[PDB]
């Protein structure tokens with residue numbers, strides 16, 4: 490069910506990421522650096538466990554989870570959140586909750602590209618990733 494998401498992916502387009510980061514309270518200097526960063530995202534499975542790595546010079550993250558089972562997460566911007574990742578409509582939907590707030594990270598495949606839609610508050614960011622061979 491998750492298999493077309495698996496592999497190594499490179500950021501090739503970003504829309505409204507500054508809006509999204511600002512909504513989360515990320516400071517201006519961090520937003521500068523992030524606006525010029527192109528992460529690599531690696532999604533792997535081993536049985537029922539998925540591991541999602543996000544790699545960049547000034548920040549790396551890694552999470553492991555089972556679909557549909559809540560996990561604790563500490564995000565790149567140091568929020569301590571309660572997370573769950575599920576498939577919905579063929580999309581990989583990651584929901585983070587903290588302090589009564591929520592954000593969603595939705596991944597879908599369109600024409601072989603991985604489209605990541607990030608929503609917090611009213612801010613909606615769309616990041617496009619291309620698969621590495």
Ligand SMILES: CCCCCCCC/C=C\CCCCCCCCCCCCCC(=O)O
Nearest residue numbers: 519522523526543545547548550565566616
């Ligand atoms: C690893 C996060 C994405 C790249 C960040 C580059 C800038 C690093 C500079 C300082 C460290 C703190 C950065 C925090 C940035 C905002 C994070 C917001 C939540 C995660 C967004 C993931 C986006 C993606 O998956 O494409």
